[PDB]
């Protein structure tokens, strides 16, 4: 009835959108995309080997401190390692043990962990007495909390399989906004380096965009075949290379509102799981869903590097906040920092 | 003089890892995964002093692609019996035997037919037959044990769904594993024992597999 016609009106709005995208669609600066000078070979190999985690690693996160990175494996722990010292610093038991993603703090005093528990449990380091204690457990979703991120030690935003993306506040331990825009699932997200904007990956590749204060959508970044896995904002804050399940590191651009040149050439096996740019702004890293990972220069589309010290899936990585290191997490209880 | 501090933090690390290496076994002794309010409505038991962390994972949407793929090193996965509904289990196994990471993890099949025995009278012993033309053409097995005082059609449907399930199991794959069909034997008394035996059997199976036939 009128509902179908109204959806058709939505599709005609999409028609105007595709008109606008075509009208702003100009040729890429082919010199810089392909003809610019390359990056060259890399001899950076796994130095800090961290094999002390007792299950399949499901996440990790470099700290804004650039010192303490959490990791929430399958054995109900958040082993808060310390890359330079290579010594774990705060073991933590967890109510359940089927936890998906763990995010660390801006200051370096709160960590949060949420998996199939449905419950985002933010953890504390108030006193250095043993059996590190929970700051609080909070919930409200009805699904596995895919991934959360700290803006400020009171401002946690997360997103889960409810197709929703909530902005918890832990001053009262509740939400402030709910980003009810998605229709697939949610897998991961990254917040703008000025901690205002983000983009939400999903199952249906529609990496929507919002902002913390409002959370009102601007731009759906469609254009992936298989499925979006991981995202990270370009080191300035106007692009992000959402990885996928079809080995497509399609590096978008925020100002454009459009695609940018895709990073797909075969001899690469299924899927991506983790992406985050180095601080140079032209050395992308993307952990492919098969047993390994390869660099993808944003100026040449050449996989001029090898991340294959891993023999099973790599389910998250991240470049150091200052750009001094990047570290992946591989399923066979075996985490490494690459340098 | 952080060097003085560093050794103290190292000793703190050792007392961090003591309970870790002492619940390494606590994890290592168990096996798991049956298949909203609180998340993982864990429902567990123990046999011959050994426990086993079997649990449903209900309390979620029905989408699974990014959800089931989580479980791994989980040496038990299935329950089966579920209008056309029984096909749901069929395609579900069709999948769970082919996920790029679940291809090397086995079901322990477990039929719940006790309600179906009485449900046949409403089904008219032909609801599956109307649904499945394969049933009429299928012959009978070799070791069939139809219990006395029961409808033969019911006693044979529980033998044909076995065979279709096995057809999937040892048709699609590569050096296929063992599925392990079963049923409900009594009122929650012997099925625990049967899955325990069957899971220690598969513990044997992958123990041998990782030593590779020796």
């Amino acid at each position: 009835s009128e509902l179908d016609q109204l959806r058709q009106e939505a599709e005609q709005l999409k028609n105007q959108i595709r008109d606008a995208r075509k009208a702003c669609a100009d040729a890429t600066l082919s010199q810089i995309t392909n003809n610019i000078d390359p990056v060259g070979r890399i001899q950076m190999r796994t130095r800090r080997t961290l094999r002390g985690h007792l299950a399949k690693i499901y996440a990790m996160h470099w700290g804004t401190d650039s010192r303490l990175l959490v990791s929430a494996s399958q054995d109900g722990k958040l082993i808060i390692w310390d890359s330079y010292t290579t010594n774990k610093v705060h073991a933590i038991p967890l109510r359940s043990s089927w936890v998906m993603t763990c995010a660390y703090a801006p200051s370096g005093n709160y960590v949060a962990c949420g998996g199939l528990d449905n419950i985002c449990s933010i953890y504390n380091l108030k006193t250095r007495e043993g059996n590190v204690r929970v700051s609080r457990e909070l919930a409200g979703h009805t699904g596995y909390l895919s991934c959360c991120r700290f803006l400020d030690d009171n401002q946690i935003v997360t997103s889960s399989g409810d197709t929703t993306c909530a902005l918890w506040d832990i001053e009262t331990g509740q939400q402030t906004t709910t980003f009810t825009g998605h229709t697939g699932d949610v897998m991961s997200l990254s917040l703008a380096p000025d901690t205002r904007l983000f983009v939400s990956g999903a199952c249906d590749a529609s990496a929507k965009l919002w902002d913390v204060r409002e959370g009102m959508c601007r731009q759906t970044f469609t254009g992936h075949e298989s499925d979006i896995n991981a995202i990270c904002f370009f080191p300035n804050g106007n692009a992000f290379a959402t990885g996928s399940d079809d080995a497509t590191c399609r590096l978008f651009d925020l100002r454009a509102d459009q695609e940018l040149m895709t990073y797909s050439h075969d001899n690469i096996i299924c899927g991506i799981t983790s992406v985050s740019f180095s601080k140079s702004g032209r050395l992308l890293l993307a952990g492919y869903d098969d047993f390994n990972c390869n660099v993808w220069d944003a100026l040449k589309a050449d996989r001029a590097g090898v991340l294959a010290g891993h023999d099973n899936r790599v389910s998250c990585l991240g470049v150091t906040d200052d750009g001094m290191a990047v570290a992946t997490g591989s399923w066979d209880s075996f985490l490494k920092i690459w340098n | 003089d952080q060097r003085n501090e560093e050794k103290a933090q190292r000793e703190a690390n050792k007392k961090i890892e003591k309970q870790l290496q002492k619940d390494k076994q606590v994890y290592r002794a168990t096996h798991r995964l049956l298949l909203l309010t609180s998340g993982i409505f864990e429902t567990k038991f123990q046999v011959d002093k050994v426990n086993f962390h079997m649990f449903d994972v209900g309390g979620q949407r029905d989408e699974r692609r990014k959800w089931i793929q989580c479980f791994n090193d989980v040496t038990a996965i299935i329950f089966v019996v579920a209008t056309n509904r029984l096909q749901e289990a069929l395609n579900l196994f069709k999948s769970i035997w082919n996920n790029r990471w679940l291809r090397t993890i086995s079901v322990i099949l477990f039929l719940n037919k006790q309600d179906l025995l009485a449900e046949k009278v409403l089904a008219g012993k032909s609801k599956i037959e109307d649904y499945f033309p394969e049933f009429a053409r299928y012959t009978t097995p070799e070791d069939a044990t139809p219990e006395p005082g029961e409808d033969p059609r019911v006693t044979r449907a529980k033998y044909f769904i076995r065979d279709e399930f096995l057809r999937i199991s040892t048709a699609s794959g590569d050096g296929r594993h063992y599925c392990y069909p079963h049923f409900t034997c009594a009122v929650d008394t012997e099925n625990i024992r049967r899955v325990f035996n069957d899971c220690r059997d598969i513990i044997q199976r992958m123990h041998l597999r990782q030593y590779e036939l020796l």
Partner: nanobody, 128 residues
Framework: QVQLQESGGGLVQPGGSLRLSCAAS????????MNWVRQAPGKGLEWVSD????????SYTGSVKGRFTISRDNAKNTLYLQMNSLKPEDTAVYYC?????????????????????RGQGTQVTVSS
């Protein structure tokens, strides 16, 4: 986007002949396997068909096997389903599908109304 076009659909008597197709949008259909499904009024969706990567290991639902036929099309990048010898039990809302990734040999796609790659969906009424 990955939008799949439910080509065809309309009233037809049982025993009739039907042919519906699924149209590609933005993905390498050859690399990309696929399925079909349906859904009944008051009942969840049901897996019907598929066709593997090359076109080899085709299968169907036990309920109506042989009656209908799935086929792929690398050249025109579209899913071909021709339905013949219609039955009164097939009257339901019909949906395309895809199996999420390429490089795969299975797919977890029936989830109630909540799947991404399911197309618009046709309500093919198969009745006299």
């Amino acid at each position: 986007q990955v939008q799949l076009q439910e080509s065809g659909g309309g009233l037809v008597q049982p025993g009739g002949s039907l042919r519906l197709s699924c149209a590609a949008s933005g993905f390498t259909f050859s690399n990309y396997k696929m399925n079909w499904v349906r859904q009944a009024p008051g009942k969840g969706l049901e897996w019907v068909s598929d066709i593997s990567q090359s076109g080899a290991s085709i299968s169907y639902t036990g309920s109506v096997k042989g009656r209908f036929t799935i086929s792929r099309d690398n050249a025109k990048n579209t899913l071909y389903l021709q339905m013949n010898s219609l039955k009164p039990e097939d009257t339901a809302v019909y949906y395309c599908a895809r199996c999420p990734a390429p490089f795969t040999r299975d797919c977890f796609d029936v989830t109630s109304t909540t799947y991404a790659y399911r197309g618009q969906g046709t309500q093919v009424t198969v009745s006299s």
